[PDB]
């Protein structure tokens, strides 16, 4: 049977990578434009209730790499500049009447894709809206000039080249130079020296520079004027207000430092980042800022800079008539690590977290009249120490809204664990202390979250007790016992240098909540792992096992054994001293636990050592199948350890997952695609009998039948590969046929064939690392397939993607599309104008309402 699927997003992506604020409606109200990755969304936080409403959401069918807002002189509405994975730059204007993003301009300059020398990664606009600049990570950058016409409509000019070969750009930001010629500050670095010195000296000798590009308007050209080398490498720049309301210049954020610099007769004013007092992290680890914000008022202006630990500091500069004397930092608050922050007018702060839920707070105290110690750059500093501060709970901010975000989803199981007619989606997601297992029920989804201790890797379901057996593992983290030992060692070090006897007692008594203050994580090859047994109904953990400070869990499976009775067992694969980059692991251990009290407690039966990391554990006909490195072994339960009875060695690189149906086993390779291996019981050997013709960085897999396997890429793809007919699993040299290919634009870590509504069509549901949920529904007739295919074709040309990308090229990112119709694009038929709808429907010999009903009929059969 030919496989033709209809792709539909049930739950849109909920993570956020970019967020900007401004008056996009043309009124005094300030909204927020966010990038969900391949989605552009508009949010309006109501200043009366303190809640964020979603007004518009648009699938752009691209990779939004940059997003900024600007405004012309005397203008009342803010435009939206977007740099995509296309070779184009787009300028959009939100129209509140039609409730749409109107593409005002779209200019092409390069090839598509997240390329190395094609602009789109960095975007920087002049603070007066006179010119924008779009730059790549290497070489070329382009400057467009923005103006208005007699009808007050925005006009864009031809690009202006600002290219420089062999130059790596860290970050670009515009400079507020009032109404002089616009200027753009770049953090650049030249690597031409490092590539011609076979000794490596030029590599360590090359240093990051801060460069300035001036756009001469009278001469209409971009010139690279200044280029000063920097002491230490900076990660990004902050545009300080300039002109008549502030001193122009830039703030370079480095590692453990922040430096004001400005061209002309201006000294460099650097200030060390105030480290947290009694920091439980590693002393050799540095501290950097992850994001920033700027709030300008007629009175003053300040910046909000968040650290790696979540500490938001308020930064103010002392004017000193025209040259800044000092940079003043003070501890503002502590929120989860954010990808962007927006200090809205009327007193509200939007925190778009890098993972997990997002937050909206109200400001009450700007930190002006407080007893907390404010830090400056003029204070004497030995360079062997840094400034210390004490973190305290929220006092300047109050939680007014929390937006739910499933990102990042690491595992998902769709099943009816509670005794209801409709199954539920159990999603193990979150990161670190903010991880969670969430139950989702539809009847859009409604969720309930139960917090977890570390980042869950994979969880299995106990068939007899319906309880969930999760493994949680995090890198460079401390276990509970090692955390207590570290606090004890710090208290011991503290009693010598006599208020410290009481201070160390208070330190041991105060346990900072890691869900709000982050987790004290340090070291390189350190690992924190926890096995948990949870009830799907309630939020209670039925059992918990902590592991070694260097033991990291990566696999789990519950199974009965033919060697013993119906009593269940739990096998957990663990690596020791992994050291991810560069890779150099020590050994591995398989925990074999007995399952007692009908799935409520774990009995440590034994630990079996093994060469490398057990990355996959799956039951297989009484015994068990385990993948260690590139070796696929079969184990049977022993009285004291796991006994090996057979192994296969010719696996290509490294096993990342195995699943079995009948006497076949599908080994997923980390880089190569799936491998079909056959196990002959009497011969007691594993023989590879099929592989694939395409390398695929597999993340998950799901066997649809005896011959087909549906898998997901690390690069955001879904493939379906089937064995050819008349394939006897005794002879080798068999190649499998790729019968379906599709690009979701988001990395998928869980594929499962199931049926959401009872009795309906069997579909294939996938989860998204960016917090999304999608489905692929098979087609029933060639009439419906041809109809939806022509709908897709017509919408590709009549309603092209919003950010310059080409839809067919986008869905063909890494492999050409094979037998998948994009329903996310087809449903945009309702968003077109009536003229185009009528024309396309007449091309299909039916009416626009008939097409809308035909589209809506699919969102009931899933």
């Amino acid at each position: 049977r030919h496989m033709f699927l209809y792709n539909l997003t049930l739950q849109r992506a909920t993570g956020i990578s970019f967020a900007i604020h401004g008056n996009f409606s043309g009124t005094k109200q300030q909204e927020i434009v966010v990038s969900r990755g391949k989605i552009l969304e508009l949010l309006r936080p109501d200043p009366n209730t303190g809640k964020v409403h979603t007004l518009l959401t648009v699938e752009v069918f691209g990779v939004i790499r940059s997003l900024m807002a600007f405004r012309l002189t005397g203008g009342t509405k803010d435009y939206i500049v977007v740099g995509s994975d296309s070779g184009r730059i787009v300028i959009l204007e939100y129209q509140p009447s039609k409730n749409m993003f109107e593409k005002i301009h779209q200019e092409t300059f390069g090839k598509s894709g997240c390329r190395r020398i094609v602009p789109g990664q960095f975007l920087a606009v002049d603070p007066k809206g006179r010119a924008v600049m779009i730059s790549a990570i290497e070489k070329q950058k382009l400057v467009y000039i923005l103006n208005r016409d007699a009808a007050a409509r925005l006009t864009i000019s031809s690009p202006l080249e600002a290219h420089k070969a062999n130059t790596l750009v860290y970050h670009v930001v515009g400079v507020d130079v009032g109404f002089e010629n616009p200027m753009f500050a770049c953090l650049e670095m030249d690597y031409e020296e490092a590539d011609n010195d076979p000794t490596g000296e030029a590599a360590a000798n090359t240093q990051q520079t801060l460069t300035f590009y001036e756009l001469d308007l009278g001469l209409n050209h971009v010139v690279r004027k200044y280029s000063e080398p920097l002491e230490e490498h900076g990660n990004f720049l902050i545009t300080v207000p300039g002109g008549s309301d502030g001193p122009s210049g830039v703030l370079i954020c480095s590692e453990n430092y922040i430096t004001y610099k400005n061209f002309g007769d201006q000294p460099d004013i650097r200030c060390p980042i105030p480290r947290r007092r009694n920091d439980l992290d590693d002393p050799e680890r540095g501290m950097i800022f992850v994001c920033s914000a700027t709030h300008k008022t007629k009175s003053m202006f300040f910046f909000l800079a968040q650290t790696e630990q979540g500490d938001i500091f308020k930064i103010t500069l002392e004017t000193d008539e025209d040259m800044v004397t000092e940079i003043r930092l003070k501890y503002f608050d502590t929120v989860p690590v954010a990808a962007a922050m927006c200090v809205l007018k009327t007193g509200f702060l939007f925190v778009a977290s890098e993972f997990g839920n997002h937050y909206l707070y109200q400001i009450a105290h700007l930190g002006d009249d407080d007893e907390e110690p404010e830090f400056s750059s003029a204070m004497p500093l030995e360079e062997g120490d840094t400034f210390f501060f004490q973190p305290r709970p929220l006092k300047n901010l109050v939680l007014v809204d929390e937006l739910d975000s499933l990102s990042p989803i690491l595992f998902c199981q769709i099943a009816d664990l509670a005794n209801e007619d409709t199954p539920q989606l159990y999603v193990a997601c979150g990161r670190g202390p903010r991880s969670s297992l969430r139950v989702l029920r539809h009847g859009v989804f409604n969720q309930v979250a139960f917090p977890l201790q570390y980042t869950p890797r994979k969880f299995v379901i106990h068939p007899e007790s319906n309880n969930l057996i999760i493994i949680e593992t995090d890198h460079n983290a401390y276990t509970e016992a090692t955390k207590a030992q570290r606090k004890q060692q710090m208290a011991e070090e503290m009693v010598e240098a006599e208020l410290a006897a009481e201070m160390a007692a208070a330190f041991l008594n105060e346990n900072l909540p890691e869900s709000i203050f982050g987790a004290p994580k340090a070291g390189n090859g350190q690992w924190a792992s926890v096995i948990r047994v949870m009830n799907p109904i309630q939020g209670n953990t039925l059992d918990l096992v902590q592991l070694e400070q260097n033991e990291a869990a990566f696999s789990v499976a519950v199974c009965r054994f033919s060697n013993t009775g119906e009593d269940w067992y739990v096998l957990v694969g663990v690596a020791k001293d992994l050291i991810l980059n560069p890779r150099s692991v020590a050994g591995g251990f398989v925990y074999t636990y007995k399952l007692v009290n009908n799935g409520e407690k774990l009995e440590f039966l034994h630990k079996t050592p093994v060469e490398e990391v057990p990355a996959a554990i799956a039951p297989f006909q009484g015994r068990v199948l385990i993948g260690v490195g590139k070796l696929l072994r079969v184990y049977d339960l022993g009285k004291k350890k796991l006994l090996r009875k057979c192994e296969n060695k010719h696996i290509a690189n490294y096993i990342s997952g195995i699943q079995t149906i009948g006497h076949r086993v599908i080994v997923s390779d980390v880089q190569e695609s799936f491998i079909w291996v056959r196990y002959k019981r009497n011969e007691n050997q594993l023989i590879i009998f099929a592989d694939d013709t395409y390398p695929r960085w597999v993340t998950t897999a799901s066997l649809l039948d005896y011959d087909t396997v549906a898998g997901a890429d690390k690069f955001g793809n879904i493939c379906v590969v089937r064995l050819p007919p008349n394939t006897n699993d005794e002879v080798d040299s068999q190649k499998a046929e790729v019968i379906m290919n599709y690009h979701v634009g988001e990395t998928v870590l869980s594929l499962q064939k199931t049926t959401l509504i009872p009795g309906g069509s069997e579909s294939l549901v996938y989860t998204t690392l960016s917090g999304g949920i999608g489905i692929l529904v098979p087609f029933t007739s060639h009439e419906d397939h041809d109809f939806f295919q022509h709908v897709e074709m017509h919408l590709r040309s009549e309603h092209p993607p919003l950010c310059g990308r080409d839809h067919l090229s986008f869905r063909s990112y890494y492999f050409p599309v094979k037998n998948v119709i994009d329903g996310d694009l087809c449903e945009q038929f309702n968003s077109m104008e009536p003229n185009k709808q009528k024309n396309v429907s007449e091309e299909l010999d039916r009416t626009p309402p008939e097409v809308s009903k035909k589209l809506e009929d699919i969102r009931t059969r899933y």
Binding site: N147, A152, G218, N581, S656, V670, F715, P816
Partner: protein, 842 residues
């Protein structure tokens, strides 16, 4: 060697004609000689010569100096026989040498401005652009103080020409360096105590700054207005006029923002309205008219009511410039929010139509266009009838220019606002006046045709009673000695056919069509095309059975008309034949359709695009009509019979049949002709396959498998052109079926295309590379990298050359996609090569 010299180039480059040695040449004189040579290579030379000479003259500009450089460049720029592109090249070299010689040009600035400033007043737009560009580059090179010093003495000059030129150049240097950099100088000069010429020149500078920079002024509009506002109450009259005109220019530039910057100017202008007269009054009115559309609704109403007394008074002015100014002011006032429609109807419209709408206004063309556009803008707000009824009776007038004026006015009004506001009395007046204006025309003014068509289409079904009255006039007009009037009547039929059909008067249209049928023997081709278009418009709206003449009689009459050499006749005849074939195919035998199709094939290679478009559309229509087989047999016969470009029409027609009828009705017979051993016809079959797949695009997704054997046979050593055309077929297939599950057969054809990658002949290897790129987009860059890695690094150097060319094409084609497709490269002892991030597991 030395490039070619025109006659006028001798005067500037004679010294280079003699072959003397530079060792004998005196110094400094020798550097001037090298300048003379570099400029010859710049002006007359190939692009490589030009770029090399530009680089050489810029990198050595400092060593040469400003003196000899400009003393050599300026006489060339003033050459009377200097081409515009040569002037542009000189402008570019001047900019590039000014960037290097920073401040050395300060002594020469004056000697530059005596040469460059005449370009700012040149009629050539690009000459003014070039002059402004080099003045800007000069103002960036030398300091602001240098420019102000060099140009200050010419401010209070006695002549007005030099004052105007200096003001324009000052505006240019302002746009070059920025408004705030010139703000103190302007503030000082606009209040000069010495003479009034200085303040007049400063105000002119501000006006030209406005005109030159437009919306880029809004940041400094308040400053400019505060600097220039004192000039409205000055004692001198010319300075008041120029201050008003500069305020008008600043308002026009800042539209629609920045009204608050003119807060100090409203009352002065308001008083001057009642104080001044003549040219100063005209300037004040112009400034007010450009300032009003910037105001709020209530204040716009207030100010307009305040100025309207004198505005109406100035309607009956003897000055023509005053008339144009007040007409523009009326158009600006009545097009703003705040000026209510009833107010305009009461106070503005009566004097407007009394004084302005006069016969002599339709004589001068500028006044004609101004009054027409202003009246249309008036109707846009006060209503269509309230404007049309006031000049509808002028459609019956003795002076034809006035009739043309009122006709164009009514036409634009009704084309903008429809005909919903027109009552029955006004409808009868419109019909009567339009019939009289059309009936009496000295010549066939197209404005009359457009007005008739627009009014008829706007009335729609309401023109039903007047339809016999119109058709009688049209019939009487078709029987005219003048051909260009018969074609105008035919065009009117073309434009009113749809309304005549809506009015349920198919008998009248049938009479029109049977009258047109006897006119197909018109000796003048343009009238023939017009009547063909009229017949097409009649056929496209009436059923085929009801149409007179019967289609069975009309189409054989149309068949020989395709042989006409005129583009219009061909286009309209083909369009009519296609409209017939689309719905009246049953009324024509297959033999007539075949004869038309064979007389229509030559028109596939017409030079005009529209003719080919129409030919293709009507060929598709007749192919849907007849059926693929009868025409396709003779198509294959003609294909084997003829060669050269004439056959390309056969190829295109085969593709048209394959697209209209499904391609399964032509592909088997098309592949059969590949069996005969003649090498000349197999190439034609391959060309047909190539264009067929390129034309059908995605439709060929169900036919790659069927053609794969013929291709794999043609990819073998049958001939060079065989494999070239087969690779072309593979390219068009891959690009067409891209994204529709054809990876199997295309990956198979790749195995036959690949061995031809080691070919020296240029055209066939180019076709092979095109096929390889098409297969890259269709199969994916992964398979291409898989086939490329096996030869990317090879002991043979030619193998490495070819495979690296392939890899470069793949890389430029899809670099981002290759990340997931690179193989494992184990790190050796001296470097790290494994990408560890891609090995992480969650």
């Amino acid at each position: 060697n030395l490039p070619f010299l025109k006659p006028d180039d001798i005067q500037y480059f004679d010294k280079l004609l003699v072959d003397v040695d530079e060792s004998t040449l005196s110094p400094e004189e020798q550097k001037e000689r090298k300048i003379m040579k570099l400029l010859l290579k710049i002006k007359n030379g190939t692009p490589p010569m030009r770029k090399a000479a530009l680089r050489q003259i810029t990198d050595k500009a400092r060593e040469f100096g400003a003196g000899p450089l400009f003393n050599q460049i300026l006489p060339l720029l003033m050459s009377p026989t200097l081409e515009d592109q040569e002037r542009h090249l000189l402008v570019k070299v001047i900019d590039r040498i000014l960037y290097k010689l920073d401040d050395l040009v300060r002594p020469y600035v004056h000697k530059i401005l005596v040469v460059i400033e005449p370009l700012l007043i040149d009629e050539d737009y690009y000459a003014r652009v070039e002059g402004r560009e080099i003045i800007s580059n000069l103002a960036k090179a030398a300091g602001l103080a240098t420019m102000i010093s060099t140009m200050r003495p010419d401010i209070d000059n006695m002549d007005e020409y030099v004052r105007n030129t200096t003001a324009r150049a000052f505006a240019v240097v302002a746009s070059a360096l920025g408004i705030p950099s010139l703000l103190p100088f302007l503030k000082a000069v606009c209040k000069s105590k010495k003479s009034w010429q200085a303040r007049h020149t400063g105000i002119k500078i501000v006006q030209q700054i406005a005109i030159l920079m437009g919306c880029a002024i809004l940041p400094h509009l308040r400053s400019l207005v505060e600097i220039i506002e004192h000039g409205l109450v000055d004692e001198q009259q010319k300075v008041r006029t120029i201050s008003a005109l500069a305020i008008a220019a600043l308002a026009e530039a800042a539209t629609p923002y920045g009204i608050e910057s003119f807060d100090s100017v409203l009352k002065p202008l308001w008083k001057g309205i009642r104080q001044h007269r003549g040219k100063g009054l005209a300037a004040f009115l112009k400034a007010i008219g450009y300032l009003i559309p910037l105001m709020d609704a209530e204040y716009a109403n207030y100010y307009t009511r305040e100025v309207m007394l004198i505005l109406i008074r100035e309607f009956q002015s003897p000055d023509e410039e005053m008339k144009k100014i007040v007409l523009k002011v009326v158009k600006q006032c009545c097009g703003t929010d705040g000026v209510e429609a009833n107010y305009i109807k009461t106070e503005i419209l009566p004097p407007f139509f009394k004084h302005f709408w006069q016969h002599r206004m339709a004589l001068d063309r500028r006044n004609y266009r101004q009054l027409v556009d202003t009246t249309v803008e008036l109707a846009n707000k006060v209503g269509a009838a309230e404007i049309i009824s006031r000049i509808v009776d002028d459609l019956k007038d003795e002076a034809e220019q006035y009739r043309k004026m009122v006709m164009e006015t009514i036409e634009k009004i009704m084309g903008n606002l429809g005909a919903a506001d027109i009552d029955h009395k006004l409808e009868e007046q419109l019909i009567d006046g339009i019939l009289y204006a059309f009936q009496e025309q000295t010549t066939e003014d197209s404005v009359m045709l457009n007005g008739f068509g627009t009014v008829v289409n706007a009335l729609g079904k309401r023109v039903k009673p007047y339809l016999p009255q119109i058709c009688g006039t049209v019939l009487w007009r078709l029987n005219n000695k003048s051909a260009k009037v018969r074609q105008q009547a035919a065009d009117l039929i073309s434009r009113t056919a749809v309304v005549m059909k809506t009015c349920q008067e198919e008998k009248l249209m049938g009479h029109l069509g049977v009258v047109l049928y006897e006119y197909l023997g018109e000796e003048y081709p343009e009238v023939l095309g017009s009547i063909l278009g009229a017949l097409k418009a009649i056929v496209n709206v009436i059923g085929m059975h009801k149409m007179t003449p019967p289609i069975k009689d009309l189409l054989p009459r149309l068949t020989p008309i395709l042989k006409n050499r005129h583009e219009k006749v061909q286009e309209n005849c083909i369009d009519l034949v296609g409209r017939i074939a689309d719905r009246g195919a049953e009324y024509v035998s297959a033999r007539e359709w075949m004869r038309i199709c064979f007389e229509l094939l030559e028109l596939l290679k017409a030079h005009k695009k529209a003719i080919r478009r129409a030919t293709v559309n009507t060929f598709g229509y007749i192919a849907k009509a007849i059926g693929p087989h009868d025409v396709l047999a003779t198509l294959l016969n003609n294909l084997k019979v003829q060669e050269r470009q004439n056959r390309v029409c056969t190829t295109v027609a085969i593709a048209i049949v394959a697209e209209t009828c499904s391609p399964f009705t032509v592909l088997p017979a098309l592949m059969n002709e590949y069996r005969v051993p003649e090498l000349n016809v197999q190439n034609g079959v391959l060309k047909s396959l190539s264009f067929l797949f390129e034309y059908i695009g995605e439709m060929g997704k169900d036919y790659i498998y069927a053609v794969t054997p013929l291709l794999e046979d043609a990819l073998m050593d049958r001939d060079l052109v065989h494999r070239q055309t087969a690779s072309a077929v593979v390219q068009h297939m891959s690009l067409g079926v891209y994204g529709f599950g054809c990876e199997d057969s295309l990956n198979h054809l790749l195995n036959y295309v690949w061995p031809n990658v080691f070919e020296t002949s240029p055209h066939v290897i180019q076709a092979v590379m095109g096929a390889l790129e098409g297969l890259r987009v269709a199969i994916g860059p992964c398979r291409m990298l898989q086939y490329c890695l096996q030869g990317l690094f090879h002991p043979a150097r030619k193998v490495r050359d070819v495979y690296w060319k392939i890899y470069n094409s793949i890389y430029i084609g899809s670099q981002d996609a290759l990340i997931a497709h690179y193989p494992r490269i184990y790190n050796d002892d001296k470097n790290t090569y494994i990408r560890y991030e891609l090995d992480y597991i969650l």
